């Protein structure tokens, strides 16, 4: 299929109306970030020649 980008929302814009929140949600989200790799060392002489 041809992928949809999002649900379509039409914002009810007018020149004298505003939307004010009356409530709130405390939302906790995860963010995973890599920091380091495995520290590898290769003996070049032993790898090439043994």
């Amino acid at each position: 299929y041809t992928m949809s980008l999002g649900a379509e929302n039409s914002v009810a814009y007018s020149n004298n109306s505003i939307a004010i929140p009356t409530n709130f949600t405390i939302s906790v989200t995860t963010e995973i970030l890599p920091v380091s790799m495995t520290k590898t060392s290769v003996d070049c002489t032993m790898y090439i020649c043994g």
Binding site: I32, L33, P34, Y47
Partner: protein, 49 residues
Amino acid sequence: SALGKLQDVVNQNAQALNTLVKQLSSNFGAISSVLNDILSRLDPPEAEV
């Protein structure tokens, strides 16, 4: 699949090590990939090559 970013780094490093170990099995056009076989089969003028 929540922790895919760390597992991607771990898999890439392990795959690079596995490829580097696997590359010893290739002879690269020589008669054998084992150095001891070449040193025990050939005179040093052609074993050098």
